[PDB]
Write a protein that binds this DNA or RNA. Structure first.
Lengths: 188, 188, 185, 188
DNA sequence: CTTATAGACCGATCGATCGGTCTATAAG
DNA sequence: CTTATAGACCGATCGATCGGTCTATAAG
């Protein structure tokens, strides 16, 4: 119970202040539990974070496969999946924290691999929208794992590095991007 | 000159470990000075950082001034800018610290302003490269703003979210993107 | 039942690490029990430790009682007592923890004698051996008390402080001491 | 200075309560300094301890260096060394903390080596007395290596495990001991 | 009731850590 | 005065540790 309360409050703060910047005490205060409790359930702050990450990944893989139904075309998917990046409440929100985290804990194998994993998931969602988009005669794409990578990483810059502007502004800026991108693909 | 030495080692550590991970103690150990001297020549770690961003962003602009000469067309600029912003050892190599720093001290719009100004200098390079082509038939985009931002964050996403790869590798990915992005532009 | 298994891991840990060094959660984990069950069968880490002490001292006394049967003379006894405090697995292996534990609690009258007589039982054995060795002409210790303490302590040092060499190596050391000591009476 | 105060106080405390039992908070309190300062002067609590140990062995090495002149025969030095061993305020008085510390850190090699080297110095001192005594014909020992370790650990027990007798009554036991030991070292 | 067994939860506090300040220098 | 260099020291915390307690279960 208090565990979940902690997982919840931790996410909120991490998204809002980042990893390092977010303090154990605050988590516990808001969570209304105890440091002793937080550390009872997660060997450490790092673990508290990776945990939240998994919980987040799944909470999304789930939202995508369930939300992409309404999309008919393999193109509509690209348009949507990118739009979600901004409207979602899972994984993307705490992207900054993820950088901040990977940045320093990049020399500890336990953490690294554990994160590239989530990374690739999103890299893949693209590999699919693109591949099956190929054969379904929507575009012929030479290298797909590259275009899928570009697309994944570029959409990421747009999401994390555009925070200052508005939701309905971001949602719109993203759409425009999707468009322009859904072209360099068309012919050769 | 220790101020130079110091600025120097501090750039390494910020690039290598990020903001919160770089400590004043390390900085004085590698620069071989003292807390006194470090704090004499600099007010706060914060202002140490900000000085560097600015001193860096400038050396970048100097680079670009010299590099864009060896280019004839705007489309040619794009590819070059984007590739440069991957090979340059100025400002981009600090994208990490810049993000964690922003995310934490974004609170008081004291650091908020300062950062935007720096990041807006980049959105501007694009606005030039873009409006310059809209007057050279290079292409046509009724909204150079939105596209200067898209291009800006996107390319940044490409640069920061890929530390994995080999530079030669990155360069190719970048160029692929340049082409793709450019493509989907002037065609009503 | 579990109380017994728990006493087991607890004893092992207290010997391997110190008293402070040994955590309850560790005890819980290695015995696969739980906090609840641990703090039900035992009142406190402190008491858990002491109970282990009394039991162990007990089984040692027992071991000595049997084991010495094979020692005709007091001289043979001495050598055996010493070699035994080296090979035994009761009580002596807990020396460290006893020390650490008292150094942080001899400040109370509770733990004071509560473990002070647990050891005088060792200066005792030496007293018997030396004494009964006097009324046997094996030697003429005109001060069993001193010599009895001296031996008990010298042996505790040799046992406690040389924990690095191998067991048979320690025994060689221990027997050499045994001979020198008797040899000097 | 405030560094020295810390060293002084941390010894008494360790001697009195043992390693794990002496808190950094208590040391700073009495030293009238701060945790910040203490952990600026010594990387860690353990390190503080070894530091103390170093000062201790050598302060001891001095006391002996000086006292071993009041003796004309190695037989003499043996009695002295053992007496000095339990009157000195150096090293020996914190055997408890050492024992404790040694077992708890038995696995960390850094510590192990350091700790052993320290102990060996005491064993060597005996080895010297014995070897000299040999060449001087005061006795004949075929295995001074062993008798040294024995003499050292034996004398150690008498010293650490008799904390309740009156010092002058203790130099009495020890002396009886030295007589026995030395005596049992010759043919009969 | 009693006996056991889990296990979530915490008060108290421990050993670090990290910006940064203050006093001492020295020399133009 | 100024610039510049050193370094002992600490305030404010921070993440984790560790005995130990309280509720929940179950079976006799």
């Amino acid at each position: 119970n208090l565990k979940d309360k902690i997982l919840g409050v931790a996410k909120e703060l991490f998204i809002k202040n980042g990893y390092n910047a977010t303090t154990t005490g605050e988590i516990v205060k808001l969570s209304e539990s105890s440091k002793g409790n937080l550390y009872y359930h997660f060997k450490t702050k790092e673990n508290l974070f990776l945990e939240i990450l998994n919980i987040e990944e799944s909470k999304w893989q789930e939202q995508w496969k369930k939300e992409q139904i309404k999309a008919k075309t393999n193109r509509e998917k690209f348009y949507l999946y990118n739009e979600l990046s901004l409207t979602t409440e899972y994984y993307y929100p705490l992207q900054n924290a993820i950088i901040e985290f990977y940045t320093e804990y990049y020399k500890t194998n336990s953490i690294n691999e554990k994160m590239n994993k989530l990374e690739n998931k999103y890299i893949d969602a693209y590999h699919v929208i693109f591949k099956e988009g190929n054969l379904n005669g929507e575009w012929s794409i030479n290298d797909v794992n590259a275009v899928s990578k570009i697309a994944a990483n570029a959409v990421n810059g747009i999401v994390t590095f555009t925070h200052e502007q508005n939701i309905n502004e971001r949602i719109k800026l993203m759409n425009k991007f999707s468009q322009i991108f859904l072209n360099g693909l068309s012919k050769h």
